[PDB]
Amino acid sequence: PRSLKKGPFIDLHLLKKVEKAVESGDKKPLRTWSRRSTIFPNMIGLTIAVHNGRQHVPVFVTDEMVGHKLGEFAPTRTYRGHA
Amino acid sequence: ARIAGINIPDHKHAVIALTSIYGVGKTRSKAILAAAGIAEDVKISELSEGQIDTLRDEVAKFVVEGDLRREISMSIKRLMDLGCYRGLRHRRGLPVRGQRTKTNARTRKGPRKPIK
Amino acid sequence: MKKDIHPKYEEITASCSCGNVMKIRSTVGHDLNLDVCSKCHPFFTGKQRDVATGGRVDRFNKRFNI
Amino acid sequence: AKLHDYYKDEVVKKLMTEFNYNSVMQVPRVEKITLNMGVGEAIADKKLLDNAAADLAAISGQKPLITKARKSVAGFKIRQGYPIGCKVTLRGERMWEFFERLITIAVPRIRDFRGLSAKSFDGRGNYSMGVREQIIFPEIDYDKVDRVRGLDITITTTAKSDEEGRALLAAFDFPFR
RNA sequence: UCCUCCUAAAGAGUAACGGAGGAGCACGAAGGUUGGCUAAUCCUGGUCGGACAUCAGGAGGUUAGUGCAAUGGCAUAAGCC
RNA sequence: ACGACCAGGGCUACACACGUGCUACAAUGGCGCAUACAAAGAGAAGCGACCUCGCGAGAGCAAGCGGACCUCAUAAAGUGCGUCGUAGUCCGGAUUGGAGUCUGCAACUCGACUCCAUGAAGUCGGAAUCGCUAGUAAUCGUGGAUCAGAAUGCCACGGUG
Ligand SMILES: [Mg+2]
Ligand SMILES: [Mg+2]
Ligand SMILES: [Mg+2]
Ligand SMILES: [Mg+2]
Ligand SMILES: [Mg+2]
Ligand SMILES: [Mg+2]
Ligand SMILES: [Mg+2]
Ligand SMILES: [Mg+2]
Ligand SMILES: [Mg+2]
Ligand SMILES: [Mg+2]
Ligand SMILES: [Mg+2]
Ligand SMILES: [Mg+2]
Ligand SMILES: [Mg+2]
Ligand SMILES: [Mg+2]
Ligand SMILES: [Mg+2]
Ligand SMILES: [Mg+2]
Ligand SMILES: [Mg+2]
Ligand SMILES: [Zn+2]
């Protein structure tokens, strides 16, 4: 994982969208290609439609989803089975 | 010979019979015996019961069998409930850490499943 | 009770690591040294501590500062 | 009879107070404790049964009554009359002394003990629990083992309801939860 | 050939290539006596243990049982130790 | 547009089958302590001492070096003592949880490494089949290219033999 001395990582355009949706207090789905951005505690309660390569899957944000990244909740490979 | 709930073989040495504890290994067993002032080459044999009470207190400093297994299952069910990629791997039975599934996933997948 | 068929059931002394002393009737014969009793079992404090859920936001804010 | 004396002096006064019973005979009391080991694997050999009765005879100083099949079932490959288990009924002082050694010694000797259930009182006060492993009793020597068994304990009391037995065992500081 | 029920018409009996089932034994205890006991099934709870082993309580009240077919009996048990 | 730009994804999927390899199933060994002997190479957006902190990967300050001068860099197997005493073991290390470091805008998919814990299969491998004639096989470590980082591969090197 990343070093603690660099802190976390988040896209700036995401952090601005978070600051806006925080102040407006709107839970409209934010479509986002930043699968590599760590979720912040100010993101709680937001629908963020993370890209997966093909579309934007909406993610409601929970308390426990903080110390993770947005890409963990958008699986890129669909697999059902062989038979 | 009964530490933290479980029994401990008497014939073996100290670090090994401690490593029978789910939550300690040879490192933490050395830290226990170092905190008790007990030599590592002695057995669970010829120990004073005061020495064993000190040992129980040092193991009780850490997290062990029932606590540790409960915490591990809680962490896994946290991933299960989130529905992350590690949760999906944990409940598909597939390897989590980014290993290969084309070949050699036999630890998580068990033995071979013949196409019948 | 019958006379011979049942095992010997004799009062012995059981002392513990918490210094409890309790005389019970048992089939052991010899004296007994215990490890935990109901007095010294961590059922009323330790098992209460042993839940230990922990916070995810608190780990996050703990690991650094903005 | 230490717990029987503790019953007679403090539990009765407690329950008469916390229930407002008209009579002291209206109070609950424990009646018997039944110790079953259902041994379905003794159909292979009697010595497994013969050793389970020896172990349970050390726990409670009684020779156990070897129980048999009431009827025949084919899913378990038994016929009516096969010795299939062993039980011990404990009454009186031997009941109280076992109940003392139980709640004082053996329940603490349970691996990962974290309490009992209060949802095992069969609607009519009689409590039933089951232990996984006989080594929690100190009567058993650990090397002197043959096979890890398990048994079940059934405390039969005179409580009509379920809560009157729950209050009775709580009066004996019985580790529910 | 023998047994049980119906046909058989409220005593007995009563036929047909009429309707349905069995027997050609078993037991030295599965007999005698004294003493004692009382089922089936289901519900809840409970270690392995599961629809179903064993254990504890409750409902129920013979719906069970009777060495074997059926019928009639059987709690004073003829049933079970 | 079959041309061009960008983000994200993918080339790493997984009921399975094969090839080539690595580590093993231990006692001619595992562990712990002490200790001896190499060659050949690379180095400036680089190699990076010493000293300090950290269990540790590493971090800080920071010399020296375009290098028979300095660094990578203590060779390991070995030997000596003690230890385990034949067990799925003090073998084996997979897997997984937690805590971290570094690189790099950025390690979720999808990096390497460290620490604690975890401790699968495996007790020498069916039919079948491969390599090798002497410093060879076997075994033991070392270095380099590619490369920000990322080898059990590749190309080279010496040790025992
Ligand atoms: Mg251990
Ligand atoms: Mg007539
Ligand atoms: Mg007539
Ligand atoms: Mg008869
Ligand atoms: Mg009679
Ligand atoms: Mg049941
Ligand atoms: Mg691109
Ligand atoms: Mg490829
Ligand atoms: Mg240091
Ligand atoms: Mg050596
Ligand atoms: Mg050694
Ligand atoms: Mg090991
Ligand atoms: Mg390890
Ligand atoms: Mg095996
Ligand atoms: Mg072996
Ligand atoms: Mg290089
Ligand atoms: Mg590299
Ligand atoms: Zn105690």
From TrEMBL, chain C:
Cofactor(s), names only, from the UniProt record: Zn(2+)
Cofactor note: Binds 1 zinc ion per subunit.
Ranges in a coiled coil: none
Gene Ontology cellular component terms for the protein in this record: ribonucleoprotein complex; ribosome
Modified residues (N6-acetyllysine): 8
GO biological process terms, semicolon-separated: translation
Cystine pairings recorded for this chain: 18-37
Molecular functions (GO terms): metal ion binding; rRNA binding; structural constituent of ribosome
Keywords linked to the UniProt accession: Acetylation, Metal-binding, Ribonucleoprotein, Ribosomal protein, RNA-binding, rRNA-binding, Zinc
Residues binding Zn(2+): 16, 18, 37, 40
Pfam family, one: Ribosomal_L31
Assembly and oligomerization: Part of the 50S ribosomal subunit.
Family the UniProt entry places it in: Belongs to the bacterial ribosomal protein bL31 family. Type A subfamily.
Role description: Binds the 23S rRNA.
Entry protein name: Large ribosomal subunit protein bL31
Organism, as annotated: Escherichia coli O145:NM
Gene giving rise to this polypeptide: rpmE
